[PDB]
Amino acid sequence: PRSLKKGPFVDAHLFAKVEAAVASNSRKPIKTWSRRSMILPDFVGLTISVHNGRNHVPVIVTEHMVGHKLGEFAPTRTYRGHG
Amino acid sequence: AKKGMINRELKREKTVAKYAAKRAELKATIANVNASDEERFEAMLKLQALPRNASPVRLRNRCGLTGRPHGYFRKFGLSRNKLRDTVMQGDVPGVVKASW
Amino acid sequence: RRRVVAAREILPDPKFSSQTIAKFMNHVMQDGKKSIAESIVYGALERVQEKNKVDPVEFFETTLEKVRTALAMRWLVDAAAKRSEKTMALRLAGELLDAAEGKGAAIKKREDVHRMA
Amino acid sequence: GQKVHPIGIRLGVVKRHNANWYANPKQYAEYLLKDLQVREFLTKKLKNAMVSNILIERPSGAAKVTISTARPGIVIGKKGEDIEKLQRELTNIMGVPAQVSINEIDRPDLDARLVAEAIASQLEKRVMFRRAMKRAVQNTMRAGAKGIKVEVSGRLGGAEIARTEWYREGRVPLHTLRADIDYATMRAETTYGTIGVKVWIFRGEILGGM
Amino acid sequence: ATNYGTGRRKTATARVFLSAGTGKLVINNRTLEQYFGRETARMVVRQPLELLEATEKYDLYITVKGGGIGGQAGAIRHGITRALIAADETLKPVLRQAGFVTRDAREVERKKLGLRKARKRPQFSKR
Amino acid sequence: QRIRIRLKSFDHRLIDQSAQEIVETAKRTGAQVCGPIPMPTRIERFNVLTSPHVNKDARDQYEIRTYKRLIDIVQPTDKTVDALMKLDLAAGVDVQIALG
Amino acid sequence: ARIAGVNIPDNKHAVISLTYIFGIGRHTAKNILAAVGITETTKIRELDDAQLDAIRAEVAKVPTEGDLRREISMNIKRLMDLGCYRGLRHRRSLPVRGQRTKTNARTRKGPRKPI
RNA sequence: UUUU
RNA sequence: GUCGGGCUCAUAACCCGAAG
RNA sequence: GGGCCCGCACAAGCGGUGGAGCAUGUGGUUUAAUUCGAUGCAACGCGAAGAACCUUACCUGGCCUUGACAUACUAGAAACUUUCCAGAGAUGGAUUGGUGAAUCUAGAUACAGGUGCUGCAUGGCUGUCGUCAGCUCGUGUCGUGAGAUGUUGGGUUAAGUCCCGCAACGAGCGCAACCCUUUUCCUUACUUGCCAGCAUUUCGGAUGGGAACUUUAAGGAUACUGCCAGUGACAAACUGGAGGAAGGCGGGGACGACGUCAAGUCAUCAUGGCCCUUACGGCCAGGGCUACACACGUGCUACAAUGGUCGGUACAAAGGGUUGCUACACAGCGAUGUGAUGCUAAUCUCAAAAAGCCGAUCGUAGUCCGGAUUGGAGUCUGCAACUCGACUCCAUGAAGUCGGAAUCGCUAGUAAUCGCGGAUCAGAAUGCCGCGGUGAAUACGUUCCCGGG
Ligand SMILES: [Mg+2]
Ligand SMILES: [Mg+2]
Ligand SMILES: [Mg+2]
Ligand SMILES: [Mg+2]
Ligand SMILES: [Mg+2]
Ligand SMILES: [Mg+2]
Ligand SMILES: [Mg+2]
Ligand SMILES: [Mg+2]
Ligand SMILES: [Mg+2]
Ligand SMILES: [Mg+2]
Ligand SMILES: [Mg+2]
Ligand SMILES: [Mg+2]
Ligand SMILES: [Mg+2]
Ligand SMILES: [Mg+2]
Ligand SMILES: [Mg+2]
Ligand SMILES: [Mg+2]
Ligand SMILES: [Mg+2]
Ligand SMILES: [Mg+2]
Ligand SMILES: [Mg+2]
Ligand SMILES: [Mg+2]
Ligand SMILES: [Mg+2]
Ligand SMILES: [Mg+2]
Ligand SMILES: [Mg+2]
Ligand SMILES: [Mg+2]
């Protein structure tokens, strides 16, 4: 994990988008390729569509998804079985 | 290598050399202790707001003549294929075939 | 090989000046840990010295021809371990005193060959 | 197959290096890449001449290059326009005041470079490869060599399946390290592809070591 | 009355200074038992002086460096015999018969390109 | 004062003659040479794959050695520093002249 | 001889016998025995019934068998329900820490299956 | 013991 | 009988193990 | 299709693999993609001496069109350097200084570009038989002639090595030798390395000093059946022994004949031919190369008492260090952090060698063996460790009690076992290439298996 003496890492364009949306109480999903930014306690409530390689999957931020990386909630590989 | 790869490398190291002083002084401001914490947080912000290609971690060593990304030797600046050819014909000073 | 070869000679052990003792502790050694091996055999010898007082180099070569040389020295190093007595220096110095008085572990091990002889 | 290179196997034995300079392990690469450029530029800047060897030295933050050519009159021209302009070209590459020395080759039939270059320039005019090979072998043995081998490889005579043809006259002891042996390779760019010429020339043994 | 010998074994040196006196030893400013905990290295060191039956007529001042236990013990033995035959050359036949005069030239053989360790090659398999 | 001369080179045939040409030149213009001491040699070695595509156990092993020699001149006269600085030395030898 | 609802071996040194409680390793056993004031080489057999009470007091300060088992089994449930990468790797019983699965995962996957 |  | 492993430059015979 | 001879080829021994868990490459399967190549021995820890972005060749989306790069033409502007807005970024817009060669910008035709195809069109490079012992010529002689002899036969040798018989006599390339390193000694050299004999000691070669010894590294000497005895054909060679550090090739490396396999490589590079040219070229962000019912190859760690843990105490070689290595001090359980010293190195540093020795404990238990897997809390590199890093701490504590048929490596400082270093590299080795410590067992023999002459 990232060092605690550096703080959490959030992208700058994503943080601008989130702070802009939180002031207007909008409901439109935020589309982003970030996938590596940390989920801040401010994100809780919003709907973020994160890239997964081919599509942008919608994610609803819950009070328990704080501290994870965005890409944790958008898997990349497809697998059903082998038989 | 293809001719776009060599220009990509030239592009990257040109941009690295352009942004050396600023990145270094931001790295110094961050690692300081007698500055404000807001100082050392705005320094962090301005550091990771540079272009991606300004970081020397994205530089890959290639053969000086052909441009091969594998089998590189830092002492020589060439990859193994041209190293064998220029050594075995006598153009590299000091190098001989080794026997213990 | 295909033409001919000679055999190698062994410096006799430095404490009792014997060659058979050196060859015996060369069968007990593994991984080049010769300190462990010489501790084991010297302990066995200085054990059989204080009990049933007799010269060790004599008692050893007396009990060897009871079991007979390499294949003889293998049965001793084997049947002394599968014994569950104590430290190896003590369950090796146990099979020697067993085989001297005609025991069944390594002494009467070769007797099984005498039946099928 | 897979023989060792005749020159590099005896580089501290009976052969010197073609580069003579020292550099600290962080300056070695810049020097190496700066004189590889000088070689790769001089080999074509002097293609019509008969250059056979190029020696590079760096005495006291300087640059000295000895060009051992078979016809210095062309690499110099009139006295004062080719050696004086070449030097102004070898500084833009070396970044240091360069010097150019000339070493005229007497008997230019005992160095494998010139024999190979001649055989290639003949093969690139549609001459029978056997004629050229035999002529070179015959013309070098008269100049005093104690042995010569020539090798030609690849789609000979405009054919469709490639093959190798070699020719020898004399002794060429390749396993004797005190035997000095000149060796060269060259490429012929024919209407059907590449042809490879290899030349070994033997001139006697060396007594005394280094 | 101070004679000197030098003995190599594998990578050890063993500078040995032999002189007249009672029987006392030092190895690297350390008595014989303080230096070799291996009890059979001591009886390699004490072999030449007990061969001639003397064992008590000589003082020995030894230094040694390089190598391991067995290497340094054999080096010291070699050096002691070479310091001994420097005093009285007459003893050289006897010391030759016990095999103390020969320098053991066996060294570690280098690892080779494409093998595990100098003679051991990787595991072979067909099909 | 004192002079220390350190010589570094890739060729020892050359370093020997440079050293023994400096020593006698100093001996002519005075005295007090402290000999060409040989310092231990650096040997770095490389393994180079000789095939273009795939053959791991087929490699050429190359080697380069650096030789170092040391010379001291203890009490030099007023005509030795010039007799030394007025000396041309062949290529492939690095000469470091130091006072302390 | 009976601590934290477990029967610990009696003919054993104390620092070795205290590790039979789920949740107590060797470091924690050393800490407990030092805090209470008992040497590590003392057998559980040689302990007065008035020292065992201070041992139980000190053990009660760290999580043990049932509390800890339930604590572990709740985090995995939370992960599996939230729906992150690790919860998914837990549902499918595959390595969660980045190991390879093309081969060598037989401790998470179990005995082999024919086809 | 079948095939090159 | 089948599936897997072994022997073979390949293949079968044969050998080992397993499931049923 | 027969005969002889040789090689860890078999036999004799020692230790493994096949069984377990993990690492790594491959096949298959899955996928948007899981980039491409290498397939008996001679592909499978192989190209790759090191895929988080980059690498990157692949996929999804967004973009450019004489182009990221060259040459020849025209017109305008010193290159260069600040501040900001949109955008995931590519990319567009706006601002600040600056005043004929170089140096950007705009337009335009030939062209550039292609890791696209053919290794069965090729050059160069490599594997393999195999360091196997063969491949030839000129004469002089035989067969009308193509050709043969030489080179075949008895021994011997690592060897077409040598001796001997021989219509052959000689000679060449291969074998050996010349080159590197190790073992003994000698000479020159005396610091940053050394400390025998003096003194001084704050006990530290530390300091007056000394040039002996160790070492450092350059040049020499020495081994040839030279001496003795036998065997042997007046032979070659072999067996013994005296000296000698060493004895018959003292040990190891490098060096790979003529040729075989349309062997491998158009993806290092070059190149004939074919194909694409608002795309099969070029620039980005995110994903993938790390997937997982399975099968195989190569490794690592164990199943313990010749051992595990804890306390004390010894003995190396070879390598690396200025964008680097760090004495020492403080903080922390620790990974590490802060300060601060020496070092461009025989000077300072990595750095602790580890197995070993002495003492205590565990007493044959799935254990004080074993460490997989999982939960929780951290450190560091980096713009960023979700997919997908390494390391530290606490807890958890699988399988495993020596492995079926079968199969592999090794002939001596070797096998076995124990640590140390480097190349690649910001970070990322159980791989690769090296270094020393401890240090064995066995070889009657050539019927059999495999390859070769
Ligand atoms: Mg290209
Ligand atoms: Mg990189
Ligand atoms: Mg070893
Ligand atoms: Mg060595
Ligand atoms: Mg197999
Ligand atoms: Mg427990
Ligand atoms: Mg062998
Ligand atoms: Mg066998
Ligand atoms: Mg291809
Ligand atoms: Mg391998
Ligand atoms: Mg245009
Ligand atoms: Mg081919
Ligand atoms: Mg080819
Ligand atoms: Mg011959
Ligand atoms: Mg040879
Ligand atoms: Mg083919
Ligand atoms: Mg192919
Ligand atoms: Mg092509
Ligand atoms: Mg990308
Ligand atoms: Mg892969
Ligand atoms: Mg344990
Ligand atoms: Mg079980
Ligand atoms: Mg055969
Ligand atoms: Mg033969």
Side-chain angles (χ1 to χ4, degrees), chain A, chain B, chain C residues 1-97 99-100 102 104-106 117, chain D, chain E, chain F, chain G:
Chain A
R2 184 171 182 82
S3 164
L4 288 191
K5 84 194 206 293
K6 315 181 76 170
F9 172 82
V10 201
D11 260 317
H13 46 263
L14 186 52
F15 193 50
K17 289 172 191 178
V18 166
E19 283 233 302
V22 94
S24 323
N25 227 299
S26 209
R27 288 304 173 175
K28 327 185 133 295
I30 301 164
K31 148 188 293 201
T32 196
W33 291 267
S34 164
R35 205 184 199 287
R36 74 177 185 185
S37 297
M38 183 142 291
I39 295 180
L40 291 185
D42 188 295
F43 289 17
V44 198
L46 306 178
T47 291
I48 301 180
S49 31
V50 285
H51 207 248
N52 79 321
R54 66 223 284 216
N55 316 309
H56 289 266
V57 181
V59 184
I60 308 169
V61 181
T62 317
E63 314 87 282
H64 310 273
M65 311 193 346
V66 157
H68 299 247
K69 299 307 205 84
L70 276 185
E72 293 211 31
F73 301 99
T76 37
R77 291 196 201 82
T78 324
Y79 178 64
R80 291 126 184 169
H82 270 293
Chain B
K2 302 185 317 204
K3 290 188 80 166
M5 290 289 176
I6 300 156
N7 293 173
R8 249 190 260 180
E9 269 300 291
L10 293 187
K11 177 217 263 278
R12 270 172 195 135
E13 55 192 44
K14 197 172 312 290
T15 320
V16 161
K18 177 172 181 160
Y19 285 92
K22 178 147 44 190
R23 183 223 180 222
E25 69 98 352
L26 284 166
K27 273 297 193 71
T29 298
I30 270 188
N32 187 269
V33 182
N34 70 27
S36 173
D37 264 40
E38 285 78 15
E39 201 67 356
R40 288 142 35 78
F41 170 72
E42 182 177 42
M44 216 165 74
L45 270 196
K46 264 195 251 139
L47 173 64
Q48 61 202 23
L50 285 180
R52 259 185 174 94
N53 270 10
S55 147
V57 162
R58 291 160 65 83
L59 280 189
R60 172 59 88 115
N61 269 337
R62 302 182 103 103
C63 183
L65 299 187
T66 65
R68 202 199 217 253
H70 274 102
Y72 188 79
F73 288 106
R74 292 188 172 186
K75 177 92 180 326
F76 298 113
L78 308 161
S79 272
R80 43 176 197 79
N81 287 113
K82 288 314 179 198
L83 193 52
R84 212 239 170 156
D85 298 37
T86 54
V87 159
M88 269 288 107
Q89 76 184 11
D91 305 334
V92 179
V95 182
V96 307
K97 279 202 79 168
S99 327
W100 278 225
Chain C
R1 273 175 300 286
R2 270 207 199 267
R3 329 302 215 96
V4 89
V5 86
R8 185 179 285 102
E9 50 71 69
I10 301 186
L11 297 316
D13 78 89
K15 209 193 92 167
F16 284 152
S17 160
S18 192
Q19 227 172 342
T20 314
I21 297 287
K23 198 56 168 213
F24 177 65
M25 108 181 49
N26 270 356
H27 281 264
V28 185
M29 174 186 56
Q30 51 215 20
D31 312 348
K33 315 190 76 57
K34 198 181 256 297
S35 288
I36 283 88
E38 68 202 11
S39 146
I40 287 178
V41 315
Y42 285 169
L45 292 184
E46 68 213 26
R47 189 70 205 174
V48 292
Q49 178 74 286
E50 76 164 315
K51 168 180 180 305
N52 310 144
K53 162 58 208 154
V54 57
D55 168 81
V57 205
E58 215 59 73
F59 170 79
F60 188 72
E61 303 183 321
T62 274
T63 74
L64 243 70
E65 46 84 11
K66 275 305 151 254
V67 206
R68 198 180 312 240
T69 328
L71 73 152
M73 291 164 23
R74 292 200 196 114
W75 307 336
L76 291 164
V77 72
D78 276 330
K82 303 138 75 178
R83 162 151 189 162
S84 270
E85 186 270 348
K86 200 24 78 173
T87 303
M88 191 71 167
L90 291 185
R91 52 191 198 268
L92 207 148
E95 186 151 88
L96 296 188
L97 309 163
Chain D
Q2 331 312 139
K3 317 178 157 207
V4 78
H5 190 112
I7 281 192
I9 193 63
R10 36 198 105 191
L11 263 176
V13 189
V14 298
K15 300 223 182 310
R16 320 287 316 286
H17 290 258
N18 296 324
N20 197 16
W21 42 263
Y22 178 80
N24 296 27
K26 67 190 309 182
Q27 291 182 328
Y28 203 105
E30 309 246 341
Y31 286 15
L32 183 53
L33 266 147
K34 255 171 197 167
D35 49 53
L36 286 196
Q37 290 189 18
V38 169
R39 291 177 197 271
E40 280 158 341
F41 152 88
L42 268 174
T43 42
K44 77 184 59 166
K45 189 58 179 307
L46 300 171
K47 189 198 263 327
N48 51 26
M50 307 168 81
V51 185
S52 152
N53 204 16
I54 300 182
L55 166 92
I56 285 152
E57 309 199 2
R58 308 208 190 212
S60 211
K64 199 191 192 314
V65 61
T66 296
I67 304 163
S68 28
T69 176
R71 281 175 185 169
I74 166 184
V75 313
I76 301 189
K78 168 245 306 151
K79 166 184 21 167
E81 77 277 1
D82 302 345
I83 289 291
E84 80 98 5
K85 261 127 71 175
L86 238 192
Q87 290 174 22
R88 310 165 196 282
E89 293 161 86
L90 294 202
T91 74
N92 263 96
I93 317 187
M94 295 280 268
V96 45
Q99 230 180 20
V100 177
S101 322
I102 293 300
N103 171 63
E104 186 254 358
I105 278 182
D106 41 9
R107 297 180 309 161
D109 277 72
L110 295 196
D111 57 337
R113 191 82 28 95
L114 298 192
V115 184
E117 254 207 320
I119 298 196
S121 104
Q122 294 174 37
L123 284 199
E124 285 191 20
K125 286 171 193 169
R126 283 189 200 76
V127 182
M128 306 77 88
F129 63 93
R130 267 206 183 78
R131 165 189 279 262
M133 286 166 50
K134 288 186 60 187
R135 174 201 283 187
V137 174
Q138 270 137 51
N139 191 51
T140 282
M141 293 307 280
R142 306 198 207 104
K146 288 156 201 172
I148 176 171
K149 203 203 308 171
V150 189
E151 243 270 15
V152 188
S153 208
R155 274 183 74 112
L156 299 168
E160 71 292 310
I161 288 178
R163 70 193 182 185
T164 93
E165 298 274 302
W166 54 281
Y167 195 25
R168 184 169 54 198
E169 192 77 44
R171 314 173 48 235
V172 189
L174 276 184
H175 294 257
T176 300
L177 290 164
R178 70 162 165 252
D180 89 314
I181 287 184
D182 221 345
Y183 172 79
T185 321
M186 262 288 294
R187 293 167 57 99
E189 296 291 83
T190 79
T191 161
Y192 298 108
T194 312
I195 304 208
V197 197
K198 300 187 168 183
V199 176
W200 298 261
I201 298 197
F202 172 50
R203 294 180 316 281
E205 305 122 13
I206 298 285
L207 302 200
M210 289 286 283
Chain E
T2 298
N3 303 306
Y4 169 75
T6 291
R8 265 72 65 116
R9 170 65 159 99
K10 278 160 148 185
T11 47
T13 73
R15 309 159 65 244
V16 174
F17 294 80
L18 179 123
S19 99
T22 89
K24 65 164 53 172
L25 252 153
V26 277
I27 314 186
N28 279 340
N29 289 136
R30 233 188 293 178
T31 162
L32 179 52
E33 283 79 26
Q34 276 175 208
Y35 200 77
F36 287 123
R38 252 245 227 193
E39 85 84 20
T40 83
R42 310 188 182 109
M43 308 161 319
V44 174
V45 172
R46 283 202 237 83
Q47 233 162 328
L49 268 207
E50 87 147 357
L51 166 72
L52 322 175
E53 276 166 51
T55 327
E56 302 263 20
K57 314 163 156 39
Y58 295 96
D59 277 2
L60 283 161
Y61 179 77
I62 301 165
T63 82
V64 57
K65 67 206 314 164
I69 306 309
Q72 291 197 173
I76 289 161
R77 200 183 75 199
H78 191 49
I80 285 178
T81 81
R82 273 167 78 132
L84 222 30
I85 81 179
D88 210 24
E89 309 80 271
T90 299
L91 316 155
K92 186 157 181 166
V94 189
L95 283 169
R96 256 215 182 270
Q97 199 273 338
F100 302 159
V101 192
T102 292
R103 155 82 152 99
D104 209 274
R106 312 187 276 175
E107 283 281 7
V108 194
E109 186 180 334
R110 62 165 278 199
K111 191 194 168 303
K112 288 160 180 46
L113 168 58
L115 282 82
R116 278 301 148 76
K117 35 171 286 199
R119 276 200 190 190
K120 178 202 187 173
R121 38 176 66 249
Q123 176 161 103
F124 173 64
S125 169
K126 286 147 49 169
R127 75 182 57 89
Chain F
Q1 312 185 267
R2 195 190 49 183
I3 321 169
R4 307 179 83 115
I5 321 180
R6 300 177 160 87
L7 311 192
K8 272 175 175 183
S9 99
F10 295 145
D11 221 305
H12 78 245
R13 259 60 160 240
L14 268 72
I15 212 181
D16 292 343
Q17 77 185 11
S18 321
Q20 73 175 317
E21 183 261 28
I22 277 175
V23 154
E24 52 111 350
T25 298
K27 273 181 174 189
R28 283 198 291 97
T29 181
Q32 320 276 270
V33 169
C34 275
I37 312 150
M39 311 297 291
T41 298
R42 180 174 138 111
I43 304 171
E44 72 246 79
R45 290 168 167 160
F46 318 89
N47 305 81
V48 172
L49 288 157
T50 51
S51 183
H53 192 220
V54 279
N55 280 309
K56 194 58 176 290
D57 312 332
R59 307 188 220 178
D60 271 19
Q61 296 193 293
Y62 298 135
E63 205 201 64
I64 172 172
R65 305 172 187 255
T66 307
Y67 308 83
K68 180 170 184 158
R69 263 77 175 126
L70 187 62
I71 298 166
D72 270 286
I73 311 171
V74 203
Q75 260 299 328
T77 90
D78 302 80
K79 44 179 292 186
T80 76
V81 71
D82 41 274
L84 286 173
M85 206 47 268
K86 264 318 302 157
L87 203 56
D88 58 321
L89 220 162
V93 182
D94 162 65
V95 183
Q96 301 284 163
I97 288 183
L99 286 81
Chain G
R2 187 198 168 276
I3 304 177
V6 182
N7 275 68
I8 79 180
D10 226 307
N11 189 58
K12 268 194 169 70
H13 291 177
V15 76
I16 286 309
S17 192
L18 262 191
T19 81
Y20 278 58
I21 314 296
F22 174 89
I24 294 183
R26 181 179 212 93
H27 176 274
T28 307
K30 289 188 168 190
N31 270 14
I32 282 168
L33 286 185
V36 68
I38 289 139
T39 33
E40 298 174 358
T41 35
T42 322
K43 298 190 184 179
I44 310 287
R45 230 179 54 254
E46 308 164 6
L47 257 42
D48 184 295
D49 309 283
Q51 290 161 302
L52 297 186
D53 310 320
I55 301 182
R56 292 193 183 93
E58 274 300 299
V59 160
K61 302 191 27 200
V62 305
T64 92
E65 233 292 343
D67 322 84
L68 185 62
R69 277 191 196 273
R70 212 184 30 77
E71 180 55 296
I72 302 298
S73 150
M74 169 240 300
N75 300 125
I76 296 183
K77 194 225 181 304
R78 177 202 276 101
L79 272 158
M80 274 200 256
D81 296 334
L82 250 189
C84 39
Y85 185 74
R86 274 166 63 205
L88 269 46
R89 271 317 183 99
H90 264 282
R91 303 171 172 182
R92 299 195 131 286
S93 36
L94 294 161
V96 322
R97 304 205 185 177
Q99 298 93 324
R100 71 150 55 205
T101 43
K102 191 178 198 185
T103 329
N104 302 168
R106 318 253 46 111
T107 175
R108 283 309 302 267
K109 289 166 63 172
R112 268 174 173 157
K113 310 171 198 53
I115 284 180

